[PDB]
Amino acid sequence: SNSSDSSSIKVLKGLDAVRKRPGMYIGDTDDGTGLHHMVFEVVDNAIDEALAGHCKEIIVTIHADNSVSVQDDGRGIPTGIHPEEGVSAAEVIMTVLHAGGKFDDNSYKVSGGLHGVGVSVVNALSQKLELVIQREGKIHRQIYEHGVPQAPLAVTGETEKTGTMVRFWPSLETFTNVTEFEYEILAKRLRELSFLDSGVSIRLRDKRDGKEDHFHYEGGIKAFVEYLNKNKTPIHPNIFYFSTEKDGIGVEVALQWNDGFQENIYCFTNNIPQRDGGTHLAGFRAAMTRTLNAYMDKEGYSKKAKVSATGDDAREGLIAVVSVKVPDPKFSSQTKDKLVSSEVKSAVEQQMNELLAEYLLENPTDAKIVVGKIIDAARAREAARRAREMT
Amino acid sequence: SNSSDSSSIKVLKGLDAVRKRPGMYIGDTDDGTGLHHMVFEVVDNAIDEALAGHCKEIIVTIHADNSVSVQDDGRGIPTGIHPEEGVSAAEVIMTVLHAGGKFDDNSYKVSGGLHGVGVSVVNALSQKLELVIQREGKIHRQIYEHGVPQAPLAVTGETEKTGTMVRFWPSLETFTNVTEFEYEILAKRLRELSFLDSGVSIRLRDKRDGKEDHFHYEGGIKAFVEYLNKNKTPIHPNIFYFSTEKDGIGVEVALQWNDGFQENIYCFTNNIPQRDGGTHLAGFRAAMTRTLNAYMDKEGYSKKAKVSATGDDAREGLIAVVSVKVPDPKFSSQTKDKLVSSEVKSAVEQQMNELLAEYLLENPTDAKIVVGKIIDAARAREAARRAREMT
Ligand SMILES: Nc1ncnc2c1ncn2[C@@H]1O[C@H](COP(=O)(O)OP(=O)(O)NP(=O)(O)O)[C@@H](O)[C@H]1O
Numbered sequence: 057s058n059s060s061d062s063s064s065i066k067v068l069k070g071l072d073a074v075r076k077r078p079g080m081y082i083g084d085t086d087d088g089t090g091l092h093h094m095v096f097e098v099v100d101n102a103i104d105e106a107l108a109g110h111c112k113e114i115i116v117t118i119h120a121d122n123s124v125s126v127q128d129d130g131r132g133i134p135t136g137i138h139p140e141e142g143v144s145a146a147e148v149i150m151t152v153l154h155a156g157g158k159f160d161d162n163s164y165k166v167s168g169g170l171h172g173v174g175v176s177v178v179n180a181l182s183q184k185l186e187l188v189i190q191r192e193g194k195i196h197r198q199i200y201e202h203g204v205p206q207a208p209l210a211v212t213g214e215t216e217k218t219g220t221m222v223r224f225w226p227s228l229e230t231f232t233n234v235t236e237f238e239y240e241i242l243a244k245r246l247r248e249l250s251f252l253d254s255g256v257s258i259r260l261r262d263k264r265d266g267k268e269d270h271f272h273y274e275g276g277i278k279a280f281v282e283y284l285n286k287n288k289t290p291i292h293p294n295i296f297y298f299s300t301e302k303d304g305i306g307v308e309v310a311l312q313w314n315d316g317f318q319e320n321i322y323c324f325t326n327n328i329p330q331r332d333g334g335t336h337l338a339g340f341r342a343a344m345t346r347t348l349n350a351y352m353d354k355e356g357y358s359k360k361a362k363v364s365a366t367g368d369d370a371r372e373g374l375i376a377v378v379s380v381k382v383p384d385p386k387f388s389s390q391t392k393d394k395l396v397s398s399e400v401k402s403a404v405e406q407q408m409n410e411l412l413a414e415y416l417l418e419n420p421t422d423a424k425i426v427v428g429k430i431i432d433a434a435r436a437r438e439a440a441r442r443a444r445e446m447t
Numbered sequence: 448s449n450s451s452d453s454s455s456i457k458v459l460k461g462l463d464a465v466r467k468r469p470g471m472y473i474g475d476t477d478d479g480t481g482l483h484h485m486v487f488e489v490v491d492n493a494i495d496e497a498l499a500g501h502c503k504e505i506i507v508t509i510h511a512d513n514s515v516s517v518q519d520d521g522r523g524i525p526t527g528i529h530p531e532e533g534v535s536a537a538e539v540i541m542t543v544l545h546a547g548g549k550f551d552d553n554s555y556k557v558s559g560g561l562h563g564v565g566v567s568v569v570n571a572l573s574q575k576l577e578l579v580i581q582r583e584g585k586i587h588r589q590i591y592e593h594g595v596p597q598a599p600l601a602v603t604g605e606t607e608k609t610g611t612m613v614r615f616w617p618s619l620e621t622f623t624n625v626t627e628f629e630y631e632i633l634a635k636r637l638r639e640l641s642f643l644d645s646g647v648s649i650r651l652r653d654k655r656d657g658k659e660d661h662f663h664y665e666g667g668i669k670a671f672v673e674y675l676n677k678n679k680t681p682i683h684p685n686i687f688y689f690s691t692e693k694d695g696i697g698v699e700v701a702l703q704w705n706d707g708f709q710e711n712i713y714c715f716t717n718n719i720p721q722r723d724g725g726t727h728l729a730g731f732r733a734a735m736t737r738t739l740n741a742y743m744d745k746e747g748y749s750k751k752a753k754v755s756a757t758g759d760d761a762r763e764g765l766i767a768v769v770s771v772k773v774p775d776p777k778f779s780s781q782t783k784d785k786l787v788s789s790e791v792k793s794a795v796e797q798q799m800n801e802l803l804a805e806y807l808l809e810n811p812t813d814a815k816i817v818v819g820k821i822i823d824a825a826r827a828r829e830a831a832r833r834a835r836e837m838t
């Protein structure tokens with residue numbers, strides 16, 4: 057009719073569709089976030105090996121030629137010929153969307169990975185990708201150029217070591233504006249990951265200027281909160297912390313208040329951060345609001361001060377880390393920005409409701425100092441409300 | 448623990464990936480978000496036929512059995528066998544991810560659709576999908592059960608009409624909790640869709656209770672702003688408006704302030720709404736702040752008042768519709784909640800900076816009034832600010 061022939065229907069094979077529409081896969085290819093998510097897509101997979109108790113060291117290097125390599129010491133990507141595909145499993149996971157060992161809990165009981173597209177997306181959006189896999193006594197190597205394998209995966213040598221090293225050179229045909237890696241952006245994620253995974257040595261090297269770091273904090277998310285408050289001024293001594301595992305879901309929370317008025321809840325799901333929060337954030341906020349007000353009410357603070365007390369008043373100056381371990385998580389996007397697994401909200405809420413209530417009662421000084429802050433917040437808030445009329 | 452062989456890696460063929468990980472394709476499958484998005488994936492395709500100037504009526508029906516059908520009087524899905532797929536173009540689009548006519552401007556100059564995934568995702572997550580294509584004098588029908596054709600696309604009759612009808616029954620194996628359609632959620636989308644597409648009769652029929660709607664507004668986004676403000680109180684007679692197309696990007700804005708204090712900015716890219724905003728919102732906000740502030744300064748308002756006038760105060764009680772019409776749009780998620788194409792920010796900002804400036808000049812009464820509002824808001828920002836940090 058109007059160029060509406062059957063031939064007007066174009067089918068994009070292989071990785072063509074991701075290069076064509078990088079947005080739904082990698083996110084923002086302009087503001088520099090999707091470019092860094094490229095390093096993160098690889099790292100996450102290494103962290104997944106760490107979760108399964110395999111990888112205990114990860115080395116991220118920014119090279120002078122504007123490429124990053126992520127080397128881990130896990131089991132290594134499977135190298136054997138695929139039973140259904142005909143080429144090495146290594147090649148399958150790199151060239152096929154929705155191909156991966158994370159479609160069940162057989163290789164990874166709990167993992168951030170689940171889409172079977174992460175590393176293939178990086179490979180697709182890369183001018184070149186070098187893959188070196190050590191496992192089953194052999195060193196394996198394979199070079200890619202825009203997702204297309206240059207030769208079949210080759211056994212280049214012998215080794216007793218196990219591991220996977222993926223080095224990629226992002227395609228500037230995809231990424232614009234921000235085209236070079238930024239050390240600090242990598243350092244932040246890597247540092248938190250270290251806090252989230254004690255025992256895992258994470259080294260960050262920058263071959264452009266020689267800078268480097270070695271994150272191996274062992275204090276967990278409690279030390280993480282301490283870190284988040286370093287150039288802050290916490291108002292109470294006892295960081296509220298708990299780590300439960302109920303109905304197959306793990307919820308770990310560490311939090312503390314400061315004298316500032318900024319709210320900062322860092323939410324994670326199987327170590328993947330949720331910029332857009334989600335069900336865990338929801339369960340956490342509803343739980344903290346119910347609990348804090350419940351304490352103010354039963355303790356008469358609400359009565360004393362006739363204070364409203366809202367979530368916002370409560371979250372003012374809050375530094376909290378909420379990490380959940382979910383067997384089969386759900387994300388509303390490929391970049392795991394929002395957690396949509398409904399069952400998680402209750403999981404976090406139940407635990408926050410019970411355990412935080414306990415915290416308040418067990419830590420009177422802390423509870424009081426915090427309640428004061430809330431009341432004061434509710435006061436200044438409504439004072440400003442009344443100040444509208446009293447202009 | 449050690450489960451890592453080539454057989455470990457699974458490859459989800461066809462629509463299995465979507466059924467496996469519906470989230471990265473349709474979003475939240477439990478709160479109703481994804482459920483209604485299913486309908487919207489369909490409607491959008493019809494709206495693109497409408498943007499292409501081929502569809503004038505769209506009838507969306509919520510059936511008693513909780514299925515929804517969308518009928519359009521457009522070109523109809525290509526029924527001709529696909530050159531390389533060896534199956535009808537209609538079946539290709541319905542069962543193959545990344546297959547459609549939006550990978551170029553041949554069938555559609557501009558279109559919200561671009562992923563070649565929308566309606567196949569729908570079918571994938573539908574326990575049943577009925578397809579009826581009235582094309583080239585013939586009626587073509589085909590039934591799918593969970594993405595699988597029950598029989599090839601068959602010609603069932605003769606016809607004088609062209610159009611596409613997709614009735615789908617969501618899979619309860621996918622969708623949970625909110626599984627019944629909400630008329631209001633559909634009505635809102637369609638009514639704004641009617642505003643964005645003058646000349647397209649959009650009908651809503653609820654076969655559960657007999658409720659019906661027929662949106663066919665012609666005042667464009669200006670009527671849209673009137674509509675949005677009718678429940679409120681606009682403070683100035685003239686709605687700011689312009690429709691330009693520079694550098695290949697069409698940008699159309701319509702705004703008006705009400706004496707309230709909320710900010711209601713609706714952003715669309717090819718009629719697709721952006722809940723999370725994006726580059727068009729960024730440019731809009733920027734140009735808005737700059738223009739007004741510039742006006743307040745040149746007209747000496749600030750030289751008297753002694754205020755900074757931040758955008759957030761300039762946007763109080765504002766209602767605006769920002770519709771961009773871009774060739775190759777970029778979204779950071781399949782659901783398209785945030786536009787990431789950087790070139791649109793410059794586009795919206797420049798256009799706004801020019802015409803908004805002119806508007807304040809060409810419309811004094813309005814300008815002084817709005818500025819009056821801004822002033823009171825910025826002043827109140829500081830009055831409330833005083834009491835705020837005054838206990
Ligand atoms: N460092 C690694 N060590 C071992 N196996 C790896 C590594 N990276 C990738 N793999 C395997 O290859 C797979 C496919 O990886 P990937 O393409 O990135 O998808 P994924 O693991 O499903 N997660 P996601 O980012 O949600 O798409 C995972 O299923 C792992 O089994």
Ligand SMILES: Nc1ncnc2c1ncn2[C@@H]1O[C@H](COP(=O)(O)OP(=O)(O)NP(=O)(O)O)[C@@H](O)[C@H]1O
Pocket residue numbers: 488492493496519521522523524525540546547548549554559560561562563564565566567568610611612
């Ligand atoms: N009602 C309709 N009328 C005419 N053509 C249609 C209709 N629906 C779908 N089509 C054709 O089939 C296609 C595939 O639709 P779809 O699977 O839903 O992807 P899309 O249009 O690329 N958009 P998106 O949601 O971004 O993936 C479009 O590319 C149209 O050419």
